[PDB]
Amino acid sequence: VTEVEIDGVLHEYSTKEGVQEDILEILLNLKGLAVRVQGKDEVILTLNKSGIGPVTAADITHDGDVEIVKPQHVICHLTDENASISMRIKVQRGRGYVPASTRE
Amino acid sequence: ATILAEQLEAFVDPILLRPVDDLELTVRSANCLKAEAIHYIGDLVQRTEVELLKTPNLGKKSLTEIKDVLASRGLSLGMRLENWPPASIADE
Amino acid sequence: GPEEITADIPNVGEAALSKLDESGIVYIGAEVTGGDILVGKVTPKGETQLTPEEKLLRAIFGEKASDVKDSSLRVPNGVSGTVIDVQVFTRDGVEKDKRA
Amino acid sequence: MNKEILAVVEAVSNEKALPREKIFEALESALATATKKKYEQEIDVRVQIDRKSGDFDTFRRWLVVDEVTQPTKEITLEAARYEDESLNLGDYVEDQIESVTFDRITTQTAKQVIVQKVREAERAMVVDQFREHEGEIITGVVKKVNRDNISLDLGNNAEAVILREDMLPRENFRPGDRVRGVLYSVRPEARGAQLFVTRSKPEMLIELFRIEV
């Protein structure tokens, strides 16, 4: 994964109303996401979830070729009745370790 | 290198194309042209300024806004198109 | 005269204030580099006296009692970052601008 | 119609005999220059000079021609058929307007461009002043010493350049000395009229003896 855009979040050091982890911890949990793509260079996955409880990795609206390989992966925990995250995730191919400081 | 390779052979106009609402002027200047079912400024360039002045859908301030837009000479220069497309505007 | 905290300053570039808002202060969240502009600040220059060639500029531009240089705050050369929090404190009597 | 320019017109210490109205246009485009960078081209020196107004809004132009060179200033008669053939061949019929370039900011750069425009006007005035005489047997005093060139300072804030090729070989001049000769350059020079004298020509000493006897 490369880019994440949470909806009501300006910078990655903020906090969103109604999720018991910071936006930085959500970025680490999305960094550990194990995902297969089939016929594309890059792809944009969409996540929408509302209600008390975890936001697992199986709550991503899957496209016609993206396949999650471990759907029990927790991202964050929503913790109120009307408090919802809605993010866009960018997943792409690559090789090795390409950090953020080299390459918005 | 031959031994090691043999040990692996069993693996391997931009102003006219833009919308009238995209203009820097206010929404009224775009709506004056849009009242005649025009969405692109190419349709405004397809019709003459005299033909637009013969319709009361445009206003006095809309005429000044049209003059301010035509001061850049990108639109309303009295041109004639086929319908929409120039040769550079080709379908691919 | 006093200093101008507004963005309206000269000697700039699209790269001089493409991350600032309409009132000089950088956004909350704008990931900057080493040497951009965070707060745009312009100060006065020379006073001396009204010259013969600048007699028409003595009073013909509202706030023409001051000159204009450049003393904007910049990120010190070397550090990156992400602006997370901006505080603005105003001595009482001074006009609050739109971001304050 | 604030009437600030009206009284700003009649300053008029140094631009009384100089073209007042042209200096307003000058200062107005200088307020419009300074921090403009977008638009389509730049600004427009041409502007409806309305004496009454004072702050003449920079108006644009369309220049009726029969040609396709200067794209933002091009009309034809076929394009004039939409105006019912009212336009004739060659007119400078204006059909567009422009605005200003701002604030706090952009106005000491406008002060700076106002100064630039004033300087250009002063250069034109100096050219006219040097054209009034058009070369005469005037004197002067050296002030600066350049490479193969001597700078002289006359009266009424006037400076003249003495070529070393039009000077004597052994006879060397320095600052503080007073020399006299006949100039022969007041038309095309460089950003005005660089007074170029020639203290070596015959006509140079034609009235030199006349000054004595």
Domain ranges in chain A are: 1-104
D108 and C68 in contact by Cβ < 8 A?
yes
Residue type, D2: N
The token duo for C53 is 């060639």
Q: Which two tokens stand for residue A85?
A: 């995250």
Other CB atoms within a 10 A radius of the CB of residue D93 amount to 14
**DSSP secondary-structure letter at A47?**
E
Work out the minimum CA distance from D192 to partner chain B, whole angstroms: 33
Give the chains touching A; criterion: ≥3 Cβ pairs < 8 Å: C
For an interface test with B, which of D39, D43, D68, D95 has the most B Cβ atoms less than 10 Å from its Cβ?
Answer: D95
For residue C17, how many other CB atoms are within 10 A of its CB?
A: 19
Contact C84 A104 (CB under 8 A): no
Resolution, expressed in angstroms to one decimal: 3.6
With touching defined as 3 or more inter-chain CB pairs under 8 Å, the answer for chains D and B is: yes
Who contacts D107 (Cβ-Cβ below 8 Å, separation ≥6)?
A: C61, C64, C68, D31, D34
DSSP code string of chain D: ---HHHHHHT--TTTSSS-HHHHHHHHHHHHHHTT---SSS---S-----TTTSS---B----B-SS--STTS-B-TTTTTTTTT---TT------B-----STTHHHHHHHHHHHHHHHHHHHHHHHHHHHH-S-EEEEEEEEEETTEEEEE-SSS-EEEEESTTS-SS----TT-EEEEEE---SSSSSS--EEEETTSTGGGTTHHHHH-
Residues 11-30 of B with CB under 8 A from D: none
Name chain D contacts of C54, Cβ cutoff 8 Å: 111, 115
Nearest-neighbour CA in chain D from B12: distance (Å): 57
Choose the mutation target among A3, A7, A10 for the interface with C, i.e. most C CBs under 10 Å. A10
Q: Which two tokens stand for residue D162?
A: 């003495």
Tokens of D206: 């034609």
Question: Which CATH architecture group holds A1-104?
Answer: Beta Complex (2.170)
Contact list, B71 vs chain D (CB under 8 Å)? 60, 72, 95-98
Alpha-carbon span D11 to D98, nearest angstrom:
27
The domain in which residue B80 lies consists of 13-86
Name every residue whose Cβ is closer than 8 Å to that of residue A12 and which is 6 or more positions away in sequence.
Answer: A23, A24, A27, C82
Domains of chain D and any CATH numbers:
4-128 (3.30.1480.10), 129-197 (2.40.50.140)
Dihedral sign computed on CA atoms, order B51, B56, B60, B62: negative
Query: Would you call A100 helix, strand, or coil by DSSP?
Result: coil
- Chain C interface, Cβ < 8 Å to A: 27-29, 31, 80, 82-84
Domains and CATH numbers, chain C: 1-94 (2.40.50.150)
Nearest to C10 among D8, D13, D109 (CB): D109
Spacing of C-alpha D151 from chain mean position? 22
Write down the residue that tokens 């206003």 correspond to.
B59
Q: Degrees (nearest 5) of the Cα angle D6, D7, D11?
A: 125
Chain B residues lying within 8 Å of D82, measured CB to CB? 48-51, 78
The CATH number given to whatever domain includes residue B77 is 1.10.150.20
Q: How far apart are CA B74 and CA B66, in angstroms?
A: 11
Find the closest chain A residue to C82 by CA distance.
A11
